[PDB]
């Protein structure tokens, strides 16, 4: 199957309460393997998966230096973007950045990406070709002109389709005993009366990895898009994920409903039905 390496960065200004909070997290697929937190004690990049701890001191020195350099640029950009958006020095604001790359099961490069946000909304993104940028508004276009003139895309591309791929391949080999697993979902249905005449049917998926999954409710084959309650996929805390989807049905009509489960780890899509006697 395919794999990804992604780094997530959040910088939050804290006017009058010190320098901005900076948190960086690195993932391979849905497994976190490094972190940096400006409010933590070490002020180092730190391991968060067993298979990265074998990296040597020169690895952690370089990761610490480069991730702190990202935090410095983000602190500068918080002030720059305050100016572009004509905001006061008093408020707290947020920059978020995600970048990374995908490889196929044979290790070939599939795609690279970088997306930036300001106060929770799109700011600027690298396009699929890794050659051009899309700014979200007229303020972000100022950044785009700067990055065009400085040939930032070419510099970033050499990382996204070069360095990123090389190290993702190394990590997949170093963590192969645990990153190549796909745990398919363990599924079941529950049933909860809400009155004498109605009940909730809840379709469960448990213990699956990766986190990507689809749960869908059909009535007589017709989808129930608007009457379905769907919760966000959530971590179990042991490396797997959980999700459920629910529908309120008339008592006695349970057998007219089916829940359909799709997961890359499932030989065939699962269909679940309440087993009324």
């Amino acid at each position: 199957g395919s794999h990804s390496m992604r780094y997530f960065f959040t910088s939050v200004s804290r006017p009058g309460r010190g320098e901005p909070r900076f948190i960086a997290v690195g993932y391979v697929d849905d497994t976190q393997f490094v972190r940096f937190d400006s409010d933590a004690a070490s002020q180092r990049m730190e391991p968060r998966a067993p298979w990265i701890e074998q990296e040597g001191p020169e690895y952690w020195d370089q990761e610490t230096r480069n991730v702190k350099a990202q935090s410095q640029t983000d602190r500068v950009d918080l002030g720059t973007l305050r100016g572009y958006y004509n905001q006061s020095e008093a408020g707290s604001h947020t920059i978020q950045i995600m970048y990374g790359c995908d490889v196929g099961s044979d290790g070939r490069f599939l795609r690279g990406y970088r997306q930036d946000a300001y106060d929770g909304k799109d700011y600027i993104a690298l396009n699929e070709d890794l050659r051009s940028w899309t700014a979200a508004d007229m303020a972000a276009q100022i950044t785009k002109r700067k990055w065009e003139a400085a040939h930032e895309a070419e510099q970033l591309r050499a990382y996204l389709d070069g360095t990123c791929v090389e190290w993702l391949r190394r990590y997949l080999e170093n963590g192969k005993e645990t990153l190549q697993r796909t745990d398919p979902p363990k599924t079941h249905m529950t049933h909860h009366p809400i009155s004498d005449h109605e009940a909730t049917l809840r379709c469960w998926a448990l213990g699956f990895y990766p986190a990507e999954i689809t749960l869908t409710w059909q009535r007589d084959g017709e989808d129930q898009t608007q009457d379905t309650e769907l919760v966000e996929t959530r971590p179990a805390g042991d490396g797997t994920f959980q999700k459920w989807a629910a529908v309120v049905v008339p008592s006695g009509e349970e057998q007219r409903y089916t829940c359909h489960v799709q997961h890359e780890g499932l030989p065939k899509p699962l269909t679940l039905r309440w087993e009324l006697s």
Binding site: F8, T10, V12, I23, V25, Q32, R35, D37, R48, S92, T94, Q96, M98, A117, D119, G120, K121, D122, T190, H192, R202, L206, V231, E232, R234, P235, A236, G237, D238, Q242, W244
Partner: protein
């Protein structure tokens, strides 16, 4: 511009009274990132609570997992208490074994 947290309170493994387990509070979909999350036992803050490193989703909203080791019983009442700028008062979500 501001998004309120979706809060889920649940156990890591299917709950069985007496057996050690993990109590999770997953807060997602919120913005901005400042948030307070406590896990409660009979209305009393649990002191040993760990949490994940802040991350975020495709729509830029944040998520966090708070978690603690616990042994479930019949009488003990567990909840997650969340405060956020979008909330008029801290929201308490009781743990319900069916959710």
């Amino acid at each position: 511009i501001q998004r309120t947290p979706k809060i889920q309170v649940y156990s890591r493994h299917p709950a069985e009274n007496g057996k050690s387990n993990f109590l999770n509070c997953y807060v997602s979909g919120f913005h901005p990132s400042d948030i307070e999350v406590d896990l409660l036992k009979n209305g009393e803050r649990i002191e040993k609570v760990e949490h994940s490193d802040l991350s975020f989703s495709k729509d830029w909203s944040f998520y966090l997992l708070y978690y603690t080791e616990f042994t479930p019983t019949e009488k003990d009442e567990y909840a997650c208490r969340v405060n956020h700028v979008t909330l008029s008062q801290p929201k308490i979500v009781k743990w319900d074994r069916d959710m």
